[PDB]
């Protein structure tokens, strides 16, 4: 049970890191494009 | 025991990815602000 609970919580952590990476990728891409456009 | 050890090591990996995401977020934010300011 403890191991299952740990995996469950770690999956939530993974989902949070994925959210963060997706937002950072969009933001860096927007900056790269801004600089190209300028 | 093996599963516990794997979870423990994976938690350290998660912590490392969190460190990295936090630093990248700060750095992209600083760039976004620099460009806004310019």
């Amino acid at each position: 049970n403890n191991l299952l609970r740990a995996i469950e919580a770690q999956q939530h952590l993974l989902q949070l890191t994925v959210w963060g990476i997706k937002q950072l990728q969009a933001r860096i891409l927007a900056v790269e494009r801004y600089l190209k456009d300028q | 025991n093996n599963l516990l050890r794997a979870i423990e090591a994976q938690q350290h990996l998660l912590q490392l990815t969190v460190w990295g995401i936090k630093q990248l977020q700060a750095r992209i934010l600083a760039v976004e602000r620099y460009l806004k300011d310019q």
Partner: peptide, 29 residues
């Protein structure tokens, strides 16, 4: 998701991390 801030993100990360620590500690006893 689109309604979440980076401060909230850090809070949620911290909360799950602390929970996992507690679970792993209890697995040792």
């Amino acid at each position: 998701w689109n309604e979440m801030t980076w401060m909230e993100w850090e809070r949620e990360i911290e909360n799950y991390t602390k929970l996992i620590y507690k679970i792993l500690e209890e697995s040792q006893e």
